[PDB]
Amino acid sequence: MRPPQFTRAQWFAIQHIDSDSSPSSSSRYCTIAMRAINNYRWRCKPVNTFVHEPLVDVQNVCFQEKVTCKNGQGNCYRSRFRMHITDCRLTNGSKYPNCRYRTRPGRRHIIVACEGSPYVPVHFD
């Protein structure tokens, strides 16, 4: 659930943009990074992906390959290049505030929904 104090665009950046950061991370990266998200949530988010490119690279995906959204609703775009991502997966038995995560680096195209003025990512697809 998006905290009401954040726009869709702000919440996307909080959850998914680690702007201009190292693609390689420690194995504790996700456990530490997810606290900022889960502090606003009722229960630990089960999976989450962070992108490491500079912010403007992620915003540029809104001007790259148009594709259909998974839900069929909205304007979705696939990145021209593979992004540097980190996938976070909640460990079994975790219960807030004891949320620990597996950390997995990766390099793949991302798909985002874009909306608004400015026209920026609002949903990781």
Residue numbers in the entry: 0 to 124
Paper passage:
A first RNase hybrid construct was engineered to combine the high catalytic activity of human RNase 1 and the antimicrobial properties of RNase 3. Briefly, we incorporated the N-terminus of RNase 3 (1–45) that encompasses the main antimicrobial region of the protein and consists of the first two helices, which include an aggregation prone and a lipopolysaccharide (LPS) binding sequence. On the other hand, the hybrid construct conserved the flexible loop L1, ranging from residues 17 to 26 of RNase 1 and reported essential for the protein catalytic activity. A first construct (RNase 3/1-v1) was successfully designed with a catalytic activity 40-fold higher than RNase 3, but alas in detriment of its anti-pathogenic activity. The first version of RNase 3/1-v1 has twelve peptide chains in the asymmetric unit. To note, the last beta strand was interrupted in residue Phe123, turning the C-terminal tail towards the active site cavity and, in particular, to the B2 region.
Based on the structure-function knowledge of the RNase A superfamily we have engineered a chimera that combines RNase 1 highest catalytic activity with RNase 3 unique antipathogen properties. The solved crystal structures confirmed that all the chimera proteins reproduce the kidney-shaped folding typical of the RNase A superfamily and thus keep the fold of the templates used in their design, as suggested by circular dichroism and molecular dynamics analysis.
